[PDB]
Amino acid sequence: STDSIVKASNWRLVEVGRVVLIKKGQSAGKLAAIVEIIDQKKVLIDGPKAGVPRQAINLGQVVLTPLTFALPRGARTATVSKKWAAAAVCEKWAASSWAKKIAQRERRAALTDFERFQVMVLRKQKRYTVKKALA
Amino acid sequence: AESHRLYVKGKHLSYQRSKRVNNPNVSLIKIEGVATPQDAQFYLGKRIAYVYRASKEVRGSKIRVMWGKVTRTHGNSGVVRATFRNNLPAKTFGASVRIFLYPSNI
Amino acid sequence: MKYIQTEQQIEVPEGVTVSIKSRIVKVVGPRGTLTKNLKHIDVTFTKVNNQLIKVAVHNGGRKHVAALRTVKSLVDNMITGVTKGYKYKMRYVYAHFPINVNIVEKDGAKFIEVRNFLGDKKIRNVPVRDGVTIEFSTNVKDEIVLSGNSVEDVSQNAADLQQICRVRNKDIRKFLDGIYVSHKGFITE
Amino acid sequence: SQPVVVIDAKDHLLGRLASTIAKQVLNGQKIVVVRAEALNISGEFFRNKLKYHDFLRKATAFNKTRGPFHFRAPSRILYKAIRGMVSHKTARGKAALERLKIFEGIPPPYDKKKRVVVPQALRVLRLKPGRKYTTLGKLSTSVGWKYEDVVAKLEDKRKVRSAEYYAKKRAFTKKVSSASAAASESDVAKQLASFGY
Amino acid sequence: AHFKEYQVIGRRLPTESVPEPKLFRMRIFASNEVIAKSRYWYFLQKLHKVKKASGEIVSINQINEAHPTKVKNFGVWVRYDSRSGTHNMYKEIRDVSRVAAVETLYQDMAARHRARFRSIHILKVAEIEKTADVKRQYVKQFLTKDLKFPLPHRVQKSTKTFSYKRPSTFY
RNA sequence: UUUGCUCCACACAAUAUAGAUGGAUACGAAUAAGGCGUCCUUGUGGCGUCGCUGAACCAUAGCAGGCUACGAAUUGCAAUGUCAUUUUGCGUGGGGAUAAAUCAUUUGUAUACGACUUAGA
RNA sequence: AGAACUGGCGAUGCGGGAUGAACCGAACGUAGAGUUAAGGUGCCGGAAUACACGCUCAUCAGACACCACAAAAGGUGUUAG
RNA sequence: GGCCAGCAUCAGUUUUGGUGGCAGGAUAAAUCCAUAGGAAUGUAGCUUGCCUCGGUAAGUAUUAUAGCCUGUG
């Protein structure tokens, strides 16, 4: 029989160990790990490496991240501190193009007028070689 | 090099009003680029000009300017309130004013 | 309430392939090919195996959960219609007037027609669908067989032949005349 | 920020698009709303057809040519929706509705211009998945529009030219990106990358 | 509201016939100390011959959560007044704290039965100690081993009014 | 009677803006799905990668922007400090084209009156 | 139709209830600034296409009390008990 | 010698941010650490048709090559 090509969607899905990125509140922009699922609408997060407290948060304030790591259901803050640095989540995340495009946003937002002038000069120098190469 | 501007363009939305009563002494300005009352707090006290045309060339030119300033922040979405020397003439509802940076704190 | 994950499963027999992408399913097998478009119900299909296919609805809350079994049964019917085929036998019941039924070739489709249905002069036609083969029976001479792959097309073509031979303005308890279905089954068995 | 805003009105909700248009066009923005025959509207098709046949009843009794004029085009149904949200009986509302142009399909001025999307009016983001909705082209054809086939014959003729423009532009960007990587290693790029760029 | 849990001790005013009366204790979910005292006298007048003027309140203490970062199944026994009579009910909630389970009790009792705050008495809030006595399906479906589920439709928030590409809902 | 008219080039003078002062920057379709790149037993294919906002991309330095391949000060501590686009007329030179309609008379396929429909160098 | 107490209209503008003598807020010299009431914040229309938990899809849904009509009796429609 | 503006230092009324110190409560409750006990949405290990270094199978086993809960300090 020929391979039945049945493929729909590889969702990032909320489970115990799923890393999330908080987008609202006091700790917006920080990584945390889902500890256990309270209901369909809210989970319990704890990210102890970045300084997030152990919270019960909705799934509206967080954004799911494609990387996960194995930790037991209903762990504590010390156990999540252990398993986070074991799986090296802050190093798997910083290699991704998501975190690079976030750091690029925060880098461009903190440029002075001199550091934008330098960008103008260097970009002119780059396009002078690129448009000569493509022609 | 092609640009020269030192202002932020905004629109004259409406007079300060209730429903069915308007107060022509205070205008509402939508500064383009502003979204919240915090970071609408940056533009408080800055000058606004409304530049328009006429036909009587008075004092050497045909364009004229109504000056005013930003006074406070309006509700929740980066609209601000402004007061002018002579008030804006209500045909400019939806017309470009220019918010300068003349009293600066940077 | 709302559920968490409702799941059904569809077994695919040997020689059959089921190509699903963006909720258009295509079943290919021994009798031929069938194609269904399930693009109105939000539901996921996973190739868990070459032998069976998982179907699942997340949340849903008793409406998706009832449409899921309908999706599973439609995919199973369009699998059975290609592994096995579909076959509907119909019988003529007439008290007095012989229902002369022929299969004519008009300008378009192969229409079939009835004549002398309770002595009418109106020649009642049925346009047939493009997946159904119509034959007559050898031993009994009051039977007509409609066979194909799509059970919906075959059953509707069998129903359209009893929706035209309907007695009007009489007593339907008294007048039991018309074409009626007798056997619903498969052609390979 | 653009002078004229071209809105690709496919898969937008009617009264959620019309509110944003009637606020922007009163603030002073020139808006053209292109491809109006693919507008969505919530509620099932027979519900919206019964609402339009309820609208068809309301005409002036003593002389019907004075009454509410029931326009049947999709662009004019969206225009009725926007005109109910603009104060169209004053000079300000009359001048605000002159900044608006609504078309079915995409006319040749706006064939070669960038189209935008209003996300707070999209059917995908706003309706629950599983709800029934109505397409304005099918509703207009059911209530008596005549040119559904014409704007569908003139649409794929445009889509052929657009999809054969996009292949040339895609090959141009692949020829740009195959040679722009030759400069991304050098000192100018390693100095630009520290600035975010 | 932003509910808190209060511990209100109260007492009848001492007389000569008894210069050491009984102390009565209530646990009251309420928004502040003022309406907590109001609810204390309201519930004590249903049980004993004592009014506000015929009594005093000995202490109010806010009870914090013992372990506010532990997911708990809470059985809530609760009576309420509908538009025809009074009914008792028993609901199971799955929250981390008592003042967060009482809030989503008061939400769904006002959503599903149209019962306002003035119609609802909370008889008992008790933690179900083990995963065998939880008997409602909407909590029992969350106590499965290795639970995981996706969120199929992601609606990204729109910061500005015009977008220049058709948004994808993928997660 | 090239005193009339039209089109062009710029030399100017008048009036009005529902409101220009870096760029309206182009696939289509789906959203319980897609975009891009590569390979290929070209398929409802395999693998990689991306989204998580356009907070992008492109242009962007030069007396309102010069000369060469030195200048800008004294618009005096701010006073839009004027640069855009339709209408219109005049002047110069440089081409180009040579008409009908209405009234009056008449017809009656029309008609209260106008209007309609006919005819007449 | 006839009474009892209070408040009001008559004699009274103003903000709200689209509009209304009586309802809600609040009673008035002429202006400026600030803050609010009753009511609201998609657009007309000044102000969150806010946030949080649920319910409902109606082939005449439903949406600010007075208030501008609604019952008895049914529906394994859906949800909770 | 005045009228129209701009800035500074003030005065009255007000509006909107940044930041410091102190006090209270179960002298916050938590987290964290130490100790004792416990169980399962049962972790190693041990039985267990083939067999994925005991994984699918389903028992045993309360920390073991993960952890959790409760009490006490």
Swiss-Prot record, chain A:
Secretion signal, residue range per the UniProt entry: none
Subcellular location: Cytoplasm
Alphabetized SUPFAM superfamilies for the sequence: Translation proteins SH3-like domain
Key words, A-Z: Acetylation, Cytoplasm, Ribonucleoprotein, Ribosomal protein
Processing after translation: N-terminally acetylated by acetyltransferase NatA.
Pfam family, one: Ribosomal_L14e
Disulfide bonds: none
CDD domains linked to this entry: eL14
Residues annotated with N-acetylserine modification: S1
Molecular functions per Gene Ontology: RNA binding; structural constituent of ribosome
GO cellular component terms attached to this protein's record: cytosol; cytosolic large ribosomal subunit; nucleolus
InterPro entries assigned: KOW (IPR005824), Rib_uL2_dom2 (IPR014722), Ribosomal_eL14 (IPR039660), Ribosomal_eL14_dom (IPR002784), Translation_prot_SH3-like_sf (IPR008991)
Any one GO BP annotation for this protein: maturation of LSU-rRNA
Subunit and partners: Component of the large ribosomal subunit (LSU). Mature yeast ribosomes consist of a small (40S) and a large (60S) subunit. The 40S small subunit contains 1 molecule of ribosomal RNA (18S rRNA) and 33 different proteins (encoded by 57 genes). The large 60S subunit contains 3 rRNA molecules (25S, 5.8S and 5S rRNA) and 46 different proteins (encoded by 81 genes).
PANTHER family: 60S RIBOSOMAL PROTEIN L14, LARGE RIBOSOMAL SUBUNIT PROTEIN EL14
Miscellaneous notes: Present with 45300 molecules/cell in log phase SD medium.
Family: Belongs to the eukaryotic ribosomal protein eL14 family.
Protein name from the UniProt record: Large ribosomal subunit protein eL14A
Organism whose genome encodes this protein: Saccharomyces cerevisiae (strain ATCC 204508 / S288c)
Encoding gene per record: RPL14A
Swiss-Prot record, chain B:
Gene Ontology biological process terms in this record: cytoplasmic translation; ribosomal large subunit assembly; ribosomal large subunit biogenesis; rRNA processing
Pfam families per record: Ribosomal_L35Ae
Single GO cellular component term: cytosol
Keyword DNA damage found: no
Positions of modified residues (N-acetylalanine): A1
Covalent cross-link site, Glycyl lysine isopeptide (Lys-Gly) (interchain with G-Cter in ubiquitin): K46
Cellular localisation: Cytoplasm
Top-level taxon: Eukaryota
GO molecular function: structural constituent of ribosome
InterPro entries reported in the protein's UniProt record: Ribosomal_eL33, Ribosomal_eL33_CS, Ribosomal_eL33_sf, Transl_B-barrel_sf
Post-translational modification as stated in the protein's UniProt record: N-terminally acetylated by acetyltransferase NatA.
Predominant subcellular localization, coarse grouping: cytoplasm
The entry's keywords: Acetylation, Cytoplasm, Isopeptide bond, Ribonucleoprotein, Ribosomal protein, Ubl conjugation
Keyword Signal set for record: no
Quaternary state and interactors: Component of the large ribosomal subunit (LSU). Mature yeast ribosomes consist of a small (40S) and a large (60S) subunit. The 40S small subunit contains 1 molecule of ribosomal RNA (18S rRNA) and 33 different proteins (encoded by 57 genes). The large 60S subunit contains 3 rRNA molecules (25S, 5.8S and 5S rRNA) and 46 different proteins (encoded by 81 genes).
Family: Belongs to the eukaryotic ribosomal protein eL33 family.
Additional remark text: There are 2 genes for eL33 in yeast.
Annotated protein name in UniProt: Large ribosomal subunit protein eL33A
Source species of the chain: Saccharomyces cerevisiae (strain ATCC 204508 / S288c) (Baker's yeast)
Gene: RPL33A
UniProtKB/Swiss-Prot annotation, chain D:
PROSITE patterns, A to Z: RIBOSOMAL_L13 (PS00783)
Chief localization: cytoplasm
Post-translational modification: N-terminally acetylated by acetyltransferase NatA.
Family label: Belongs to the universal ribosomal protein uL13 family.
Keyword annotations from UniProtKB, A to Z: Acetylation, Cytoplasm, Isopeptide bond, Phosphoprotein, Ribonucleoprotein, Ribosomal protein, Ubl conjugation
Name this polypeptide is given: Large ribosomal subunit protein uL13B
Domain of life: Eukaryota
Swiss-Prot record, chain E:
Swiss-Prot/TrEMBL keywords: Cytoplasm, Isopeptide bond, Phosphoprotein, Ribonucleoprotein, Ribosomal protein, Ubl conjugation
UniProt cross-references to Gene3D superfamilies, sorted A to Z: 3.10.20.10
SUPFAM superfamilies to which the protein is assigned, alphabetical: RplX-like (SSF160374)
Superkingdom of origin organism: Eukaryota
Any one Gene Ontology BP term: cytoplasmic translation
Keyword Secreted part of the UniProt annotation: no
Residues annotated with Phosphoserine modification: S31
Positions bearing the Glycyl lysine isopeptide (Lys-Gly) (interchain with G-Cter in ubiquitin) cross-link: K124, K130, K148
Places the protein is found: Cytoplasm
Extra information: Present with 54300 molecules/cell in log phase SD medium. There are 2 genes for eL20 in yeast.
Function field: Component of the ribosome, a large ribonucleoprotein complex responsible for the synthesis of proteins in the cell. The small ribosomal subunit (SSU) binds messenger RNAs (mRNAs) and translates the encoded message by selecting cognate aminoacyl-transfer RNA (tRNA) molecules. The large subunit (LSU) contains the ribosomal catalytic site termed the peptidyl transferase center (PTC), which catalyzes the formation of peptide bonds, thereby polymerizing the amino acids delivered by tRNAs into a polypeptide chain.
Family listed: Belongs to the eukaryotic ribosomal protein eL20 family.
Protein name, UniProt field: Large ribosomal subunit protein eL20A
Organism whose genome encodes this protein: Saccharomyces cerevisiae (strain ATCC 204508 / S288c)
Annotated gene: RPL20A
